[PDB]
Amino acid sequence: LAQRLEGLRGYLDIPQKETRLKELERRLEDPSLWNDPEAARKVSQEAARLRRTVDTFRSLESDLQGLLELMEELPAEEREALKPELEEAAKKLDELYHQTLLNFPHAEKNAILTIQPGAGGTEACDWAEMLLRMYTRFAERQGFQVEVVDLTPGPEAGIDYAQILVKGENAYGLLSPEAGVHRLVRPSPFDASGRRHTSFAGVEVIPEVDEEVEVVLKPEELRIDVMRASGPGGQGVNTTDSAVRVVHLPTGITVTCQTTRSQIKNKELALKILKARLYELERKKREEELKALRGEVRPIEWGSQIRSYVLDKNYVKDHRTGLMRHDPENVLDGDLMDLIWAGLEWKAGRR
Amino acid sequence: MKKVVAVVKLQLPAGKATPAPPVGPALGQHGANIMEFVKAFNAATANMGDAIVPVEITIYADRSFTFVTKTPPASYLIRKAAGLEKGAHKPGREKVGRITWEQVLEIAKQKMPDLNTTDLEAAARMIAGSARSMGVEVVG
RNA sequence: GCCCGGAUAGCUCAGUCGGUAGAGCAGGGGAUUGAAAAUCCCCGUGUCCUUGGUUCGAUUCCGAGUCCGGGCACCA
RNA sequence: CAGGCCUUGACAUGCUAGGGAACCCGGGUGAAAGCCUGGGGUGCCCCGCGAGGGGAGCCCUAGCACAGGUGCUGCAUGGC
Prior knowledge:
The structure is cut from a larger assembly and holds chains A (351 residues) and B (140 residues). Helices cover 24% and strands 18% of the residues of chain A. With 351 residues, chain A is an alpha+beta fold. In chain A, a hairpin with an 8-residue loop joins strand 2 and strand 3. Chain A is flat. Chain B starts with 6 loop residues before the first strand and ends in a 13-residue tail after the last helix. Chain B folds into two domains: 1-70, CATH 3.30.1550.10; 71-139, CATH 1.10.10.250. The interface between A and B is small, with 10 and 10 residues. Chain A binds two RNA strands through residues 73-75, 122, 155-157, 187, 190, 192, 194, 196, 233-237, 260-261, 265, 312-315, 326-327. The PDB classes it as ribosome.
């Protein structure tokens, strides 16, 4: 039965892109468009994207008719001689899956998971302590490798902050959908009456992109000036061009120095300062280009959940897709492939 | 190869060919049509079999042309003798194929026309240079 | 840039005429409590910054370098 | 759990069709399960000694309504 839904997950993209390839393949056959060196190249990449949209619709209409006509579930001669014919043609059905997973700008490299507790205090940290081992076995079942970059306890019970680094081929694309706030509803163990309580905890995901730390400001964009020193001194402060002004032309920042009585020790001391003030205003942008590059889903409040885990009535609710799984104690072991399959369709389906 | 000032020589696919992917529009840029070389053309491709078909074109500026069919390129006819599909990312001394001595004279019954020599030995030593291009060994 | 002092467990500090590596906190196990903290028992924990030398052998004694904390950069 | 198989299903009732209606005994391939395949032959209601089949236990193939669950919910419940 596991083949009627996946063969249709590329069937809604047919007319949406099929009628579009015609008003694009009909511009190339006229040379009048080639006069644009780039507008005739821009049209030839989408025209070259008629390679994943004119090959699949060819090797996908034979896997739905050559299998659903003589398929008896009663052991026969034309049935188990027809299963090895689609066993590598269903093992190949993953080629249409990875095409909605490998298309992220940076899903290749290892990812970073920050499991931080949220609403519910004492209980809510036990939730993050449970979600931590939940994602731990998951990345240990698929084969990936773990690095616990940070884990820190706290007061009563749970976990304060958990930062882990998981490697392996195409890892970020797998843990990118599990980026939000996961809600839990179960009988509170940290209560005397055992009341039914709810807990919130946040999960952030960010890949490992840039790593080096180098800012060699070659004196190529610097405009150094040498003005006459100001203040005390003697004949030498009047007549020697002591004061120096290093000017950063591509930015507008200007540093000055007059501490000493020499020019070569003051322009060098003004660079030991310009490099410093740059090492904070060139890293402030790697903190401001990365505070809106993560996303937005992080209120942790009551009403911002991506998935709900409840062991009371026993079920898991994916609020993105709408699915309701009934194995919560089973999802808490690492079985996430399926809700990640669906989160990589719901997420990259609106863009 | 024919005449000039308006011609194009391509090596069409096999089975289907009407769109723009292969070279479909390149000939319209230099003058061509859609109703002259698609269905009223595949009369030969339905006969030649499959793979590649080095049939060409000759423009006259009035839907006329000298559709001179040709024999499959020596790049493909060799994938038949050895078996490999591509050849080698870079030829030389290592290659994922093999081709014995008389293996190169098996294609001699294919390529015979316009090669230059009517005989079999004065035209095989030509393909032996093509056995050092894609790579294909010469079992000896 | 000169002169003076330092880096030793994850943290903060002691220490040897050269051959012995130590204290408090953290961390791990157990114990108590219903459960936390506090309290009690039981442990582990290091190229003594790197690079050379003398010596029978250096964490310590000299040479070089890197970083850190200070004092100095005056008269015109 | 991995693997080999069975799907009217191991069992309860009941319906419909020709088989078939107590029934006991071999062979073959497979690790086994199961699938295939070889025989004696069925008292009986009984026009009727009979050709036949009505025939009740009742086994076999096919079809239907169903069977099955140690899957969840012990803050949905009984009972203990």
